[PDB]
Design a protein around this ligand. Structure first.
Ligand SMILES: *[C@@H]1O[C@H](CO)[C@@H](O[C@@H]2O[C@H](CO)[C@@H](O)[C@H](O)[C@H]2NC(C)=O)[C@H](O)[C@H]1NC(C)=O
Ligand SMILES: *[C@@H]1O[C@H](CO)[C@@H](O[C@@H]2O[C@H](CO)[C@@H](O)[C@H](O)[C@H]2NC(C)=O)[C@H](O)[C@H]1NC(C)=O
Ligand SMILES: *[C@@H]1O[C@H](CO)[C@@H](O[C@@H]2O[C@H](CO)[C@@H](O)[C@H](O)[C@H]2NC(C)=O)[C@H](O)[C@H]1NC(C)=O
Ligand SMILES: *[C@@H]1O[C@H](CO)[C@@H](O[C@@H]2O[C@H](CO)[C@@H](O)[C@H](O)[C@H]2NC(C)=O)[C@H](O)[C@H]1NC(C)=O
Ligand SMILES: *[C@@H]1O[C@H](CO)[C@@H](O[C@@H]2O[C@H](CO)[C@@H](O)[C@H](O)[C@H]2NC(C)=O)[C@H](O)[C@H]1NC(C)=O
Ligand SMILES: *[C@@H]1O[C@H](CO)[C@@H](O[C@@H]2O[C@H](CO)[C@@H](O)[C@H](O)[C@H]2NC(C)=O)[C@H](O)[C@H]1NC(C)=O
Ligand SMILES: *[C@@H]1O[C@H](CO)[C@@H](O[C@@H]2O[C@H](CO)[C@@H](O)[C@H](O)[C@H]2NC(C)=O)[C@H](O)[C@H]1NC(C)=O
Ligand SMILES: *[C@@H]1O[C@H](CO)[C@@H](O)[C@H](O)[C@H]1NC(C)=O
Ligand SMILES: *[C@@H]1O[C@H](CO)[C@@H](O)[C@H](O)[C@H]1NC(C)=O
Ligand SMILES: *[C@@H]1O[C@H](CO)[C@@H](O)[C@H](O)[C@H]1NC(C)=O
Ligand SMILES: *[C@@H]1O[C@H](CO)[C@@H](O)[C@H](O)[C@H]1NC(C)=O
Ligand SMILES: *[C@@H]1O[C@H](CO)[C@@H](O)[C@H](O)[C@H]1NC(C)=O
Ligand SMILES: *[C@@H]1O[C@H](CO)[C@@H](O)[C@H](O)[C@H]1NC(C)=O
Ligand SMILES: *[C@@H]1O[C@H](CO)[C@@H](O)[C@H](O)[C@H]1NC(C)=O
Ligand SMILES: *[C@@H]1O[C@H](CO)[C@@H](O)[C@H](O)[C@H]1NC(C)=O
Ligand SMILES: *[C@@H]1O[C@H](CO)[C@@H](O)[C@H](O)[C@H]1NC(C)=O
Lengths: 205, 420, 384, 49
């Protein structure tokens, strides 16, 4: 039942062909559904009236089939254009588009063939074991507001760290990890902690 | 008159002039998308023959035309539930909003649910629901998800989005303060996050006012919902056309099958009834064909709405004009009759100044280039500044990187670069 | 279900199998209360028929017409009827009937039809092309012959009373040149009160119950009910958008009845797979639990499914938030579908959750790309 | 041959219109494909069939 989309496309085409064949058993108002009954039982002037009912019904039966196959072919083409886009963006690339190449942050995709279709094995990073932390938008030091270059300020309860967004790795807060912008008073929810200057002990030593 | 294409504009281009925006506006733009259509089903034997046994026996001679019409309408009806499920059921858990609304000055109260309602729609979802407005075997089947279930999905998508950013799409909802979520959304458009925290009251007031303007638009202006009302009107016009076609003779002595059967005896009646069967069957095949083509147009719109849900609501989109005009910040889903409405929040840069500019700075014969941003001058001094918001920084060996000597670069300029 | 799918296995799902339709309990016949036998003897057994240049029209009204007395009369050489079959006339009735009486030569009966041509049809007796009626003729060489030169020949139903006049030497020894009498009956079907009705006896009326009705020859099936529709005095019937009669005035008591078709709907059958259980539940679509382990959904009356106060993922979709499943001791159960587990995200203005670890998930997405390249030789399909 | 997609869209619409016009030459089982033959040769009751 995993292959349900491809088996559905097989089943619809088989159901459409079997419906088209079964419609040859229909009278459409003629004396028989079988054209050789009409032609063996009736002479030309009488037979041609009966055969025109079968031609009309069988031609309507074919026009119904071809119309539904044109609409079904447009649905398959929309899916083929989507599969061609997943090939380009997920297989030949890495996609920033949320939930385009499977749930989680996309890493890569591998194509596998299947009958009348394609299967993508979308490899994704899913973040998995949270901790709660106290957080701040900025750090006050010497009256300057410091913001993260990359990542987030967090606290374990006693100490302040800067860390990347998608994986907890606590770094000491330094003038390399952070950038100044203006004074403290402007920022709603700024917090007071030191910011280490990596040059200072090199010159103090 | 000859139609105007737009106002004409000579862009003030020259080889050393740049315009940098000194201010912004938080635009909120409303995008309305059809997602489903009315799940009709037609009993083709009752449409064609109206419980005449005489006609019902003649209709068997046409074989599986009647059963494949019922099959086609059932396939259309089932995909309306699929279309609705694919748009709204993108959230695995029914997230709910905290009792305290400490969102850093932003005010979602007009887009979050109100418990006061009989169905717990938001204020804007009630406007969107107010602005959109037989015995012949035609029937309407209910949707699988009720409008109260669609409102629980838009509430869960919205409460996840507010409390956790994009993270509820990528995994479990990770809580984050809304001022810090918007600071990431500013970095996602290349605007340095200090621009939010330094302007947070202004940005909150522009958002709250822009949501207020959505209510004023939707309260006054019924033509906003035109895409959803068009989808209702087309399905109603198609059903009314299908019912009116029962009044047609198609060349029979009467359009009314009980006239034929009360006036004519069997051999004469069956000739007349076959004209009505032929015309009424052609009338259904015409209806079902146009509903199959219309269902494919609604499915294309539901696939688009499901993609805007994933990329605009569950994410932040880099795709230009996908999630409204301007640089996308975030989108909020609101439900509407047979559709979805996205309130696309976007940063629009808003108050330009002209500056002299250069690709690089010569100092000590080295060419220095910006790590991020642009060199600009106010006329006397040279600064490096970010692209999407004017914030002039002194040019330093931290803001800039060397690459080779001066002579290679077309339009390099001479200024000192400070070494901290 | 097995017969609907043309299959002996049925897969798990919900299938629209069949149509529920409340049946007519009894038949109801309404006709005007009048009993004069119509004066057809004064038409067909008249002493002399008129000349075709100056034919006579007899209005027939306020009477009972026993048309089989005409149709069974072996004297009639033709009884051709157009918008009606002569067998049906006793079941059916008219506002008026008009009988046109005259004599012609026996060759000329062939001219008396809708859209026929020849000098009698061209000059002095023209029928409409959409004529509803019967043309009735017999040889009268035993009675109208003598010859009898009093018989004289010259828009639809216009009386056109040297010049285009001729007369007939009707003599007993004449075969084409013999006199024939003709009666043409024109039937006025229009939506006024009927006044020429067949011998068919009226029943009593029935209200608020499904019946197989007949008013003045308007046959149908429905629940008859009293109505507020202000029919103007000249109006006998009211019509739906589909031309089907929506209300009627009773011919004996001039009160106005709505006609509502008897209660009906789709019969969906809810089944686990037959390769799991032979138990099923039935949804009578849109119907209330009255006309039909019983549960009124907003999709219809659901029977044979046990209503459950829990909620689960939607297994088989019924509609309007309801689903059904087969569960443990086993039964089919029906429940409101669960949208997902509820979660208050632990938000506060200074709390963040950061993930300390990851999982590399591999997710499988399956997409259709092509379909079977069929090709049909339409001449061999159609004509073999 | 560079513009193949646009010329294909022109060709399909022209082929569809030419097919629609050519179908006026078909009898569909009538005595003539030409409606003025029927109306000049046959009287009303026979012509309407
Ligand atoms: C927060 O993190 C800091 C640094 O990782 C922790 O401080 C250290 O704690 C260990 C014992 O666990 C001591 O041996 C070190 O000497 C401490 N270092 C400093 C610089 O103080 C701190 O304990 C953590 N707090 C909590 C609540 O987890
Ligand atoms: C961060 O530290 C500064 C001092 O370094 C705090 O400023 C003092 O705040 C108190 C209470 O408002 C005042 O009485 C003092 O006069 C302030 N001193 C100065 C030098 O401004 C500041 O409140 C701290 N910030 C936070 C968020 O706790
Ligand atoms: C969020 O915005 C809404 C309006 O968009 C504010 O609602 C109004 O609040 C005042 C009382 O403060 C009431 O008198 C009005 O009747 C409210 N209007 C509506 C339409 O409800 C709401 O106060 C704002 N929230 C906060 C926390 O300021
Ligand atoms: C940036 O633009 C905003 C408007 O989008 C300016 O804010 C308005 O300023 C006037 C006074 O000049 C106030 O009366 C309004 O109440 C402000 N509007 C809002 C929404 O707060 C802002 O002053 C501009 N800033 C700069 C530096 O140009
Ligand atoms: C370009 O920017 C520089 C720095 O902002 C301006 O120089 C300062 O000008 C103010 C007066 O407006 C003086 O008080 C400062 O002492 C100047 N600083 C330095 C380092 O010179 C300069 O005036 C601006 N020029 C223009 C044309 O706007
Ligand atoms: C930037 O400054 C340098 C000097 O520091 C300029 O170089 C001189 O340019 C003139 C004209 O080409 C030459 O005659 C001198 O020999 C150059 N001197 C040196 C030391 O190279 C340079 O032209 C300036 N660049 C611009 C764009 O004005
Ligand atoms: C009804 O009466 C008018 C006369 O009032 C007839 O009209 C004349 O018809 C002949 C041909 O039949 C023409 O030559 C005359 O020129 C017509 N006269 C006028 C005044 O129009 C009319 O034909 C009669 N209708 C029928 C069917 O006989
Ligand atoms: C974070 O803290 C809140 C405190 O109410 C708790 O409900 C939540 O489950 C915690 N989350 C994690 C991942 O520890
Ligand atoms: C959070 O809210 C408290 C009051 O509940 C306030 O004192 C504090 O400054 C706020 N902090 C942030 C980061 O907004
Ligand atoms: C920039 O300079 C040009 C000079 O022609 C002027 O037209 C334009 O209005 C200026 N733009 C701004 C934003 O000052
Ligand atoms: C711009 O063009 C002028 C000549 O019009 C030239 O002297 C100058 O070097 C050019 N500057 C840049 C930045 O290309
Ligand atoms: C005409 O008269 C004969 C008796 O002379 C009678 O049998 C016949 O039924 C009458 N026909 C009609 C139509 O009254
Ligand atoms: C006709 O019958 C109704 C009852 O069905 C009666 O009320 C009415 O008075 C009768 N009219 C005549 C003229 O007998
Ligand atoms: C059918 O039922 C049998 C038990 O009678 C079971 O073993 C088998 O796996 C079932 N097959 C399917 C396709 O459900
Ligand atoms: C069903 O019918 C009863 C009267 O027989 C009525 O009271 C009830 O409201 C109806 N319920 C629905 C859902 O139609
Ligand atoms: C559902 O639960 C309520 C009490 O919460 C009870 O009264 C009712 O009978 C239950 N219904 C069924 C179908 O068991």
């Amino acid at each position: 039942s995993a292959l349900g989309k491809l088996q559905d496309v097989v089943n619809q085409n088989a159901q459409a062909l079997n419906t088209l064949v079964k419609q040859l058993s229909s009278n459409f108002g003629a004396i028989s559904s079988v054209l050789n009954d009409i032609l063996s039982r009736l002479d030309k002037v009488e037979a041609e009236v009966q055969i025109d009912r079968l031609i009309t019904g069988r031609l309507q039966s074919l026009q119904t089939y071809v119309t539904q196959q044109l609409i079904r072919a447009a649905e398959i083409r929309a899916s083929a254009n989507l599969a061609a886009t997943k090939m380009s963006e997920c297989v030949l690339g890495q996609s920033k588009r949320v939930d385009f190449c499977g749930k989680g942050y996309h890493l890569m995709s591998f194509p596998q063939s299947a009958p009348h279709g394609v299967v993508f094995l979308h490899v994704t990073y899913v973040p998995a074991q949270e901790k709660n932390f106290t957080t701040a938008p900025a750090i006050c030091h010497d009256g300057k507001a410091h913001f993260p270059r990359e990542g987030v300020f967090v606290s374990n309860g006693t100490h302040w760290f800067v860390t990347q967004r998608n994986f907890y790795e606590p770094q000491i807060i330094t003038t390399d990890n952070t950038f100044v912008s203006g004074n403290c008073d402007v920022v709603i929810g700024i917090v007071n902690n030191t910011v280490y200057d990596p040059l200072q002990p090199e010159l103090d030593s | 008159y000859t139609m105007s294409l737009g106002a004409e504009n000579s862009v003030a281009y020259s080889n050393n002039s740049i315009a940098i925006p000194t201010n912004f506006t938080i635009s909120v733009t409303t995008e309305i998308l059809p997602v489903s259509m009315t799940k009709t089903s037609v009993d083709c034997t009752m449409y064609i023959c109206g419980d005449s046994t005489e006609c019902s026996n003649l209709l068997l001679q046409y074989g599986s035309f009647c059963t494949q019409l019922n099959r086609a309408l059932t396939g259309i009806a089932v995909e309306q539930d699929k279309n609705t499920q694919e748009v709204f059921a993108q959230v695995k858990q029914i997230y709910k909003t905290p009792p305290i609304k400490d969102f850093g000055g932003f005010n979602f109260s007009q887009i979050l649910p109100d418990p006061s309602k009989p169905s717990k729609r938001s204020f804007i979802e009630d406007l969107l629901f107010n602005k959109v407005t037989k015995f012949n075997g035609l029937t309407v089947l209910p949707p699988l998800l009720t409008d109260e279930m669609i409102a629980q999905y838009t509430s869960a998508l919205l409460a996840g989005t507010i409390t956790s950013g994009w993270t509820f799409g990528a995994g479990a909802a990770l809580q984050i303060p809304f001022a810090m979520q918007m600071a990431y959304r500013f970095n996602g458009i290349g605007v340095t996050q200090n621009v939010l925290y330094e302007n947070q009251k202004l940005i909150a007031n522009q958002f709250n006012s822009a949501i207020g303007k959505i209510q004023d638009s939707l309260s006054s202006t019924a033509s906003a919902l035109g895409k959803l009302q068009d989808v209702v009107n087309q399905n109603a016009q198609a059903l009314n056309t299908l019912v009116k076609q029962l009044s047609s003779n198609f060349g029979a002595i009467s359009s009314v099958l009980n006239d034929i059967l009360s006036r004519l005896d069997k051999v004469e009646a069956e000739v007349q009834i076959d004209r009505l069967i032929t015309g009424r069957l052609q009338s259904l095949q015409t209806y079902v064909t146009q509903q199959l083509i219309r269902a494919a147009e609604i499915r294309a719109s539901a696939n688009l709405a499901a993609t805007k849900m994933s990329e605009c609501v569950l994410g932040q989109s880099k795709r230009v004009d996908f999630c409204g005009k301007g640089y996308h910040l975030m989108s909020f889903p609101q439900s509407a009759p047979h559709g979805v409405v996205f309130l696309h929040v976007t940063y629009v840069p808003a108050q330009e100044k002209n500056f002299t500019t250069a690709p690089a700075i010569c100092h000590d014969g080295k060419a220095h280039f910006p790590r991020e941003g642009v060199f600009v001058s106010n006329g006397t001094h040279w600064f490096v500044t970010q692209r999407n918001f004017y914030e002039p920084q002194i040019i330093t060996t931290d803001n800039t990187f060397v690459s080779g000597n001066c002579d290679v670069v077309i339009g390099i300029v001479n200024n000192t670069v400070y070494d901290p | 279900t097995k017969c609907t799918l043309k299959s002996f296995t049925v897969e798990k799902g919900i299938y629209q199998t069949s149509n529920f339709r409340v049946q007519p309990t009894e038949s109801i016949v309404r006709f005007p209360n009048i009993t004069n036998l119509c004066p057809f003897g004064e038409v067909f057994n008249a002493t002399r028929f008129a000349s075709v240049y100056a034919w006579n029209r007899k209005r027939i009204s306020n009477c009972v017409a026993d048309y089989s007395v005409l149709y069974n009369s072996a004297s009639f050489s033709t009884f051709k009827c157009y918008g009606v079959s002569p067998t049906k006339l006793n079941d059916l009735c008219f506002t008026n009937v008009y009988a046109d009486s005259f004599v012609i030569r026996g060759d000329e009966v062939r001219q008396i039809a809708p859209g026929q041509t020849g000098k009698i049809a061209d000059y002095n007796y023209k029928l409409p092309d959409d004529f509803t009626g019967c043309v009735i003729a017999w040889n009268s060489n035993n009675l109208d012959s003598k010859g009898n030169y009093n018989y004289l020949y010259r828009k639809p139903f216009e009386r056109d009373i040297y010049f285009p006049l001729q007369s007939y030497g009707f003599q007993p020894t004449n075969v084409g040149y013999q006199p024939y009498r003709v009666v043409v009956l024109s039937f006025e079907l229009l939506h006024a009160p009927a006044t020429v009705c067949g011998p068919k006896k009226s029943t009593n009326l029935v209200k608020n119950k499904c019946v197989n009705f007949n008013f003045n020859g308007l046959t149908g099936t429905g629940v008859l009910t009293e109505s507020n529709k202000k029919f103007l005095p000249f109006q006998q019937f009211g019509r739906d958008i589909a031309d089907t009669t929506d209300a009627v005035r009773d011919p004996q008591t001039l009160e106005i009845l709505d006609i509502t078709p008897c209660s009906f709907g789709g019969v969906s059958v809810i089944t686990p797979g037959t390769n799991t259980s032979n138990q099923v539940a039935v949804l009578y679509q849109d119907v209330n639990c009255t006309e039909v382990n019983v549960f009124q959904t907003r999709a219809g009356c659901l029977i044979g499914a046990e209503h459950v106060n829990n909620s689960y993922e939607c297994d088989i979709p019924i509609g309007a938030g309801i689903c059904a499943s087969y569960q443990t001791s086993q039964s089919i159960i029906a429940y409101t579908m669960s949208l997902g587990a509820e979660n208050s995200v632990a938000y506060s203005n200074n709390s963040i959750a950061i993930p300390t670890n990851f999982t590399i998930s591999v997710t499988t997405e399956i997409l259709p790309v092509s379909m079977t390249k069929t090709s049909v030789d339409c001449t061999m399909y159609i004509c073999g």
